[PDB]
Amino acid sequence: VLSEGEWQLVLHVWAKVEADVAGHGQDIEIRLFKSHPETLEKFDRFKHLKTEAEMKASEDLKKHGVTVLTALGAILKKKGHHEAELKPLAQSHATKHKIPIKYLEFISEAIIHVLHSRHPGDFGADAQGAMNKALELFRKDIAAKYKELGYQG
Ligand code: HEM
Numbered sequence: 001v002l003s004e005g006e007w008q009l010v011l012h013v014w015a016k017v018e019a020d021v022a023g024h025g026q027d028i029e030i031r032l033f034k035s036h037p038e039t040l041e042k043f044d045r046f047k048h049l050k051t052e053a054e055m056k057a058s059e060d061l062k063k064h065g066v067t068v069l070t071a072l073g074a075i076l077k078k079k080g081h082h083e084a085e086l087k088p089l090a091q092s093h094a095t096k097h098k099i100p101i102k103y104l105e106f107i108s109e110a111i112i113h114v115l116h117s118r119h120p121g122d123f124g125a126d127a128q129g130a131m132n133k134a135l136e137l138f139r140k141d142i143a144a145k146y147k148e149l150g151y152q153g
């Protein structure tokens with residue numbers, strides 16, 4: 001469980017994310033694909049993009065990163081009261097896209113790296129631990145949901 005001040009730190013840096021959701025999404029996507037290329041194999045629509053600039057230029061990748069970050073922000077603003085928001089994301093990612101919890105750890109790393117690379121002044125050691133606990137909770141809860149749907153990833 002997170003404290004109230006932990007959630008405040010989480011939402012305080014997310015308000016900075018929401019100034020440019022599309023650019024944060026591009027960066028987190030591209031950091032995901034570069035740090036762990038097997039993850040790009042899950043995107044039939046994006047695994048033809050070969051260089052960084054092709055990813056940056058893809059309107060279709062940009063839109064999708066806004067979609068990703070919008071759903072995550074909605075989860076974070078529920079401060080752990082996210083079953084309603086999390087179940088659809090569990091359904092699709094367990095039974096359709098088939099995303100193991102490691103891929104979720106990979107993107108949590110990407111998120112924390114981009115957050116630090118755009119907002120150091122606002123993402124020091126407490127904010128960074130608070131965001132870390134929030135994403136840990138998301139990964140724990142969504143793993144329990146994966147299991148409920150019969151997916152062991
Ligand atoms: C914080 C983590 C994540 C959040 C909040 C998130 C959320 C979403 C949302 C809202 C969509 C569109 C609707 C849906 O299919 O559920 C989506 C699509 C998708 N997501 Fe995730 N997602 C992330 C985890 C991942 C990871 C780790 C991968 C791959 C390694 C991945 C790739 C999948 C794929 C393959 C689609 C379909 C993309 C398409 O063809 O349009 N996602 N994701």
Ligand SMILES: [Mg+2]
Nearest residue numbers: 029064065068
């Ligand atoms: Mg994605």
